[PDB]
């Protein structure tokens, strides 16, 4: 029974070790995601949460009729 069907205890042990390492890495990455989202929404100087402003290319740089501007 142990030879034909059941897996070795070392195989299950190291498979469990790899699974635990992968899930611990995923949990740490999720916590880092929450922290970075909070910090960079609060500061607003990151690639995300960048609400758009007016583009500066639409300003006319030519002189006007009245120079007091």
């Amino acid at each position: 029974i142990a030879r034909t069907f059941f897996d070795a205890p070392e195989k299950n042990y190291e498979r469990t070790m790899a699974i635990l390492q992968i899930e611990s890495e995923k949990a740490e990455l999720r916590l880092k995601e929450l922290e970075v989202r909070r910090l960079m929404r609060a500061k607003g100087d990151g690639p995300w949460f960048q609400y758009p402003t007016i583009d500066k290319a639409l300003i006319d740089h030519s002189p006007k009729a009245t120079p007091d501007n």
Binding site: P63, P67, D68, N69
Partner: protein
């Protein structure tokens, strides 16, 4: 905010061109032909400085 700087009347006292509209309109072409260089200097100063107080003289 800051105090706005203004020149006094002593920098604003000059002789005036006390003439009507048609008096200026009749000789306006010779006006633009003869006294052109000081006019160009004054309005280039006005257009680049964008401040009367730096162009008065």
């Amino acid at each position: 905010p800051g105090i706005v700087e203004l020149p006094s009347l002593e920098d604003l006292k000059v002789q005036e061109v006390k003439v009507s509209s048609s008096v200026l309109k009749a000789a306006a072409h010779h006006y633009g032909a003869q006294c052109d260089k000081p006019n160009k200097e004054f309005m280039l100063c006005r257009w680049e400085e964008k401040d009367p107080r730096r162009c008065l003289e």
